[PDB]
Ligand binder design. Structure first.
Ligand SMILES: NC(=O)c1ccc[n+]([C@@H]2O[C@H](COP(=O)([O-])OP(=O)(O)OC[C@H]3O[C@@H](n4cnc5c(N)ncnc54)[C@H](O)[C@@H]3O)[C@@H](O)[C@H]2O)c1
Ligand SMILES: NC(=O)c1ccc[n+]([C@@H]2O[C@H](COP(=O)([O-])OP(=O)(O)OC[C@H]3O[C@@H](n4cnc5c(N)ncnc54)[C@H](O)[C@@H]3O)[C@@H](O)[C@H]2O)c1
Lengths: 236, 236
């Protein structure tokens, strides 16, 4: 069963496709991002601040007054983006900071809103990266950000983490998504190895409506070889 | 060979024992912390800021003008501390923020100063936690902070990460250290399972002076059962 989904990163490439797709099925969808999703049922704009508790408390408070005593079926934390760099690079502190606001702050706020507003049996999805299961020398801030999302996935499947009875926390782990910005960025890239966003919107639909939902704490790899996308469990 | 060690967290429980101990051997020791270590050969005070690039750039710049074209034998990032909490807790955003400034920001700055100022063959130590190799439900910010240090350890052992030829990046992974603050905190705890700080100061001495140094990217567990401390490799 579904009807109430919260998308954290509602105005990103993947996030707006999810907001379009569940709104198409007439579901109540709220968007959480730094810009309004006028297409969502409700947007929450995240405050641009260097303080994490300020950003955190403003979203937790905005979401609490929007939902009151109403639980949602899913929270999809699709928030993220990318930046490279090895430890010697001059863009290292800039890029690390982007990566952590984008992946660590959003995943952490999403995990607190799920213990408060997820339904029993509800779903929470986190965004990982397959590359971060091994070291990432040329993506230090990215690899670190994403490894912390994988370890957090495990904590939330642990006993007494805050999570509702029956609720699952799954970490999705792509390699590269198909996005217009990626296509003009890696113009010689073999787009056939890029995952369509639509496949993940279908996967998210199924996991929400009970069909083939992974176990809590699962790390799912999303790999597309020659236009076909497989799903492969990974262990922390 | 040793003579120049940089201790990041020079004024913490472990860090000041390291600064005392190598200064005892007449080594040049610099301290990096939020308070001066008048006992160190040189202290750098870290700026209290919510901006990471500001804190980062002020330490990188202070250390660069203190060393000029001089490399150091080791960088010991012992910076850290602890706070608990599951995802539903009201102290969650407070504690996550502490954990990330303390473990993620310091480990990340230390990894950039090592690519710039570590000698070929030099050592870099990072502080992990054994608990963060599995999920940590009642220590969400801690487990995440420490998992990112373990993944960063792996990236730095990867090819072309910035790290000097022959240099190693090892992640030390305790359970509980023996500290006066821990003893009055867990007064019924069996202190016999707590690692003496002195054992790690001896271990750090050996790894710096070539004796039994682990391979780069290694995760070492530090476990003390009944006053005896063993060292056990772990794999990411
Ligand atoms: N090639 C890839 O796109 C690729 C590769 C590996 C992993 N993934 C991961 O999949 C996820 C989605 O991919 P995507 O292409 O849609 O990324 P995206 O950049 O297109 O969408 C991310 C959206 O989330 C928002 N998000 C970032 N900070 C936020 C904040 N502080 N508050 C609220 N929302 C915030 C951003 O503003 C952005 O609109 C990301 O986590 C990404 O890291 C993608
Ligand atoms: N029970 C334990 O003490 C225990 C358990 C598990 C892991 N470890 C880990 O071992 C390491 C050392 O243990 P400890 O007892 O000496 O911790 P500690 O608190 O006694 O010492 C940490 C010092 O590093 C500093 N550090 C934190 N933020 C800093 C910053 N922004 N700039 C510069 N330095 C900063 C702190 O000010 C503090 O003085 C820590 O990383 C800790 O997480 C310890």
């Amino acid at each position: 069963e579904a009807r109430r989904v919260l998308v954290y990163g509602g105005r990103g490439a993947l996030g707006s496709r999810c907001v379009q797709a569940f709104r198409a099925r007439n579901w109540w969808v709220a968007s959480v991002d730094v810009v309004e999703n006028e297409e969502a049922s409700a947007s929450i704009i995240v405050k641009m601040t260097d303080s994490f508790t300020e950003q955190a408390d403003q979203v937790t408070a905005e979401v609490g007054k929007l939902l009151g005593e109403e639980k949602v079926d899913a929270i999809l934390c699709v928030a993220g983006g990318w930046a490279g760099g090895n430890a010697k690079s001059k863009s290292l502190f800039k890029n690390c900071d982007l990566m952590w606001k984008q992946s660590i702050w959003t995943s952490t706020i999403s995990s607190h809103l799920a213990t408060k507003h997820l339904k029993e049996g509800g779903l929470l999805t986190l965004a990982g990266a397959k590359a971060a299961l091994d070291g990432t020398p040329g993506m230090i801030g990215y690899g670190m950000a994403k490894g912390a999302v994988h370890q957090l996935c495990q904590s939330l499947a642990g006993k007494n983490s805050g999570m509702p009875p029956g609720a699952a926390a799954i970490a999705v782990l792509p390699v590269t998504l198909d996005t217009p910005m990626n296509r003009k960025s890696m113009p010689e890239a073999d787009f056939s190895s890029w995952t369509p966003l639509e496949f993940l919107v279908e996967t998210f639909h199924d996991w929400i409506t009970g069909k083939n939902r992974p176990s809590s704490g699962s790390l799912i790899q999303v790999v597309t070889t020659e236009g076909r996308t497989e799903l492969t469990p990974a262990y922390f």
